[model samples]
Target: MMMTGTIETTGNISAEKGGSIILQCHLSSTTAQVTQVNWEQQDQLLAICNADLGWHISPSFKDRVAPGPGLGLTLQSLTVNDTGEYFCIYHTYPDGTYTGRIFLEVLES
Candidate 1:
């Protein structure tokens, strides 16, 4: 697929405490192959999916956050602390890095 050299996501996402949020990072059709994908929260690495190294989620978020078929990260069992700017970072051949940001708001339940 010929991509636009970019990724996609909803700028703002919201979920109630104990709920979940799928930080969408679907790539826009592109010829550049995405070699690695990373999900970051407030400048902290949450999870990583690499073409060669496979997937790894931070120890603290192993169960609550996961890499997946959604081309993004799934954050489950949300808490107010989860509210922040999340980033979907992708690295592609001949394309370098493309990032998409998402702001999450966790509502008190």
Candidate 2:
């Protein structure tokens, strides 16, 4: 099957230091053959931590980021270094792209 739609996160997000949060991107299509899913910050690609085909994380974020359970990406053990805008991108049979942004705020403990 081919993908006729896209997926994206809900709204902006803010997280305090030492806290954890989940960004959700609801998929418009349910094709099980999605070849690639990725996360980006600004114009720079972040990483895709989950996929049946496996993923290659940048050396900078090698062990820092990971994929959430199902949809969307999750950043664990939030810290000041994690504060920034995040985008989610995915591609299916037809090949499409969608993006959502999250603004993270790291508050002092």
Candidate 3:
């Protein structure tokens, strides 16, 4: 079953167009092992990870991003086009699907 929960992005983020950044997200007060988290840019899938499977990347985002334990995301080689908001979806046992978003601003290098 899917559950709704909060999302944390480690605050707002700003970075050079060519730099890499790791967006942080965690389940507050949740100490159990997370099965998976979905990371997306808009409606597109960027990455997803599981406890046993590790990380799975989309075709375009391959080698460029990493999905997290609690649904955090790590982006690589930032581009002006990458400037936008990212959404994370976390499903818990009794809470259902919980989603959160993080905004990213790209600066000229």
Candidate 4:
């Protein structure tokens, strides 16, 4: 009853193990008070951004890439195993939690 709702994108993304891609996962409203933003692949952490603390890249990706502003995430030096369903989870102030999902296909290069 707190969140307005969830948003999802049914799009396919292609990349190579050594390639890089950026995902724009920002909320539609710029004024929305976001508490946290998390990017995950098959529920595993990839990148994270917080309203108060800022961005935090997962250890596995720290060496290659990091999270960007506005709930967006960038993945670099990807791996085939990174190919999977991904989601961006957003936690906002008094708005509860919302999520967006997409699929990733990482190829070998």
Candidate 5:
């Protein structure tokens, strides 16, 4: 059997200078159990959440990026520098890895 999935985002997220936005990643698979989910900002690993694997935040984004236990990651305090392409990576045993990309736009309040 072939297993596959996809990740999606709002595409164009317009947020104020001091607001928050959650990038959503949806995955679909028939025979895979999602083990790890990671959020990367411009090729840099920002946050990661894993079940039975624990959660982690990159040193640079330690206090900036917040990832809760289980799944989903959040970035607080929207800023001009935060505008960029974010990537979602999913990993599953035997099913391998899948990734998706989305762009974020920040506006002045």
Candidate 6:
């Protein structure tokens, strides 16, 4: 059985402009196998992660973002425009989709 919520994300995070931050999502249940993961903000897909196909970073974020360590997203060269709500959507077999939300605030440098 999965935990109350299969996916978990941090509440709020802050980063300085031109700095960097890593936003991560965790699967609370060991039994849940995540097949594909997506990182998005305001309905814009930032990146896609899969075990076999490798990672596809969206053109908008290609130079600043990377995927790793179980659906985690690392953003470099942060900008004030990046301040917003981001979502991590993980797909699992039979379990369907599990989503996690993260709020980011980019402070002026």
| lDDT scores of the candidates, listed in order | 0.80, 0.66, 0.72, 0.72, 0.73, 0.83
Using all chains and alpha carbons, the TM-scores for the candidates as numbered come to: 0.86, 0.68, 0.78, 0.74, 0.81, 0.87
lDDT (tens digit, per residue) of candidate 2 on 1-109: 6536556566776667776677767666655345666788877876774456466567877556666656566666777877788777666655455555667677676
| Predicted model with the maximum lDDT | 6
The reply for model 6, stretches above 4 Å from the true place, is: 1-4
Candidate 4, clashing residue pairs? none
On a 0 to 1 TM-score scale, where does candidate 6 land against the true structure?
Answer: 0.87
**Which one wins by TM-score: 5 or 6?**
6
How many pairs of residues collide in each model?
4, 0, 9, 0, 0, 0
Question: Per-residue lDDT for 76 in model 1?
Answer: 87
Backbone clashes in model 1, listed as residue pairs: 2-29, 2-30, 3-29, 3-30
Which residue runs does candidate 3 get wrong by more than 4 Å?
A: 1-5, 29-33, 51-53, 67-71
Give the local distance difference test score of model 1.
0.80
Clashes of 2: 0
Ten residues in sequence with the least summed lDDT for candidate 2 = 91-100
Q: Sorted by TM-score, highest first, which candidate order results?
A: 6, 1, 5, 3, 4, 2
Model 5, 14-65: lDDT tens digits are 6677776667676665467878888887658887777665787867776567
How far residue 86's Cα lies from its native spot in candidate 3, in Å, is 0.3
Model 2 misses residue 72 by how many Å? 2.8
User: Residues 1-109, candidate 4, lDDT per residue (tens digit)?
Assistant: 3335445453569887788787766565434577888877664777777756677775766876666634676667888977778888888767767788878899885
Over 1-109, each residue of candidate 3 has an lDDT whose tens digit, in order, gives 3333455667678889778788877776544445667787777978776677677786777767865434566778888888898877776665556677888898896
> After superposition, which runs of candidate 4 have C-alpha atoms over 4 Å from their true positions?
1-10, 29-31
Error of 3 at 36 (Å): 2.3
How many Å off is the CA of 18 in candidate 4? 1.9
lDDT of 4 at 68: 64
